[PDB]
Amino acid sequence: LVPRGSNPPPPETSNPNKPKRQTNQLQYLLRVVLKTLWKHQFAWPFQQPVDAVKLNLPDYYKIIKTPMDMGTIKKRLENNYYWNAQECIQDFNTMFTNCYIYNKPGDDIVLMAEALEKLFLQKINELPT
Amino acid sequence: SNPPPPETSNPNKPKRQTNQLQYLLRVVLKTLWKHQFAWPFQQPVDAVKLNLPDYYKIIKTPMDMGTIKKRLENNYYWNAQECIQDFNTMFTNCYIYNKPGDDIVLMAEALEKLFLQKINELP
Ligand SMILES: Cc1noc(C)c1-c1ccc2c3c(cccc13)C(=O)N2[C@H](C)c1ccccc1
Numbered sequence: 001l002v003p004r005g006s007n008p009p010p011p012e013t014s015n016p017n018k019p020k021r022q023t024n025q026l027q028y029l030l031r032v033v034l035k036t037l038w039k040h041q042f043a044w045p046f047q048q049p050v051d052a053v054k055l056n057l058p059d060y061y062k063i064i065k066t067p068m069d070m071g072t073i074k075k076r077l078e079n080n081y082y083w084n085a086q087e088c089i090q091d092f093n094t095m096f097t098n099c100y101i102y103n104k105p106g107d108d109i110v111l112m113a114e115a116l117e118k119l120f121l122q123k124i125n126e127l128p129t
Numbered sequence: 130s131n132p133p134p135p136e137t138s139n140p141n142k143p144k145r146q147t148n149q150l151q152y153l154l155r156v157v158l159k160t161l162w163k164h165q166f167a168w169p170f171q172q173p174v175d176a177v178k179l180n181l182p183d184y185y186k187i188i189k190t191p192m193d194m195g196t197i198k199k200r201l202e203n204n205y206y207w208n209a210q211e212c213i214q215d216f217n218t219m220f221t222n223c224y225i226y227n228k229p230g231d232d233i234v235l236m237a238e239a240l241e242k243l244f245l246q247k248i249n250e251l252p
């Protein structure tokens with residue numbers, strides 16, 4: 001039973017002094033890539049930061065030091081928080097590798113992440129040049 | 130003309146299914162295949178179409194993910210290491226033939242990073 005306050009603050013989704021832009025690529029990231037992944041049947045555990053209290057995982061944030069989730073990525077894209085598509089792609093990469101680090105190849109959550117990862121790579125193929 | 134591609138079947142070769150070989154098809158190859166830079170590596174190097182009269186004068190152990198795919202689907206390998214060697218061959222062939230600045234090399238480097246990330250999790 002994991003106590004209250006065991007979760008770190010979520011990753012920031014706004015920063016007035018960070019330089020940022022809207023680009024054709026970042027707009028495609030929101031309007032095609034994030035949307036396609038969000039609506040997927042396996043998206044839901046990834047739609048918000050991992051809640052180690054609710055999930056009773058006293059080890060999660062002892063192992064994962066660079067948390068990321070699609071809810072954070074969504075808010076970032078909506079807030080035009082990124083300078084370029086690569087910064088956003090790096091957040092997806094973080095989300096996936098975190099899952100693969102914390103969990104075990106047989107786990108349901110891993111099957112879900114592999115599904116979304118393949119979909120992700122497919123949608124990145126048509127990322128505007 | 131191009132040489133015949135590498136073999137994907139061989140009745141005399143010792144063969145097994147292992148869980149590691151199944152991981153190589155289901156996770157490693159099937160993730161890599163979807164990557165935006167996978168396409169040049171999905172079939173043998175076509176030296177006629179590419180006008181590379183030196184390619185098969187230099188590369189004598191060609192390999193590609195198309196060959197690897199077929200080999201995994203055909204249960205061609207005895208252990209995961211033979212398949213891993215095929216990937217390593219494909220990558221080093223690219224690095225051998227090309228110059229470090231080349232777009233194909235950056236593509237290769239991206240794919241090899243993903244490949245290593247998946248190999249990291251071999252059971
Ligand atoms: C994603 C993710 N990355 O690391 C972990 C742990 C999760 C995770 C695993 C299992 C979860 C969740 C849930 C919400 C958010 C993150 C996670 C959640 O409800 N579960 C349950 C226990 C679950 C089990 C099996 C498949 C899907 C969800």
Ligand SMILES: Cc1noc(C)c1-c1ccc2c3c(cccc13)C(=O)N2[C@H](C)c1ccccc1
Nearest residue numbers: 169170173174175179181222223226227232233
């Ligand atoms: C892979 C690979 N390994 O050695 C060579 C040469 C290649 C190769 C280089 C450039 C290619 C291809 C193509 C298909 C299959 C193999 C290769 C191909 O269409 N190109 C074009 C010319 C190309 C130029 C720059 C980046 C990617 C592809």
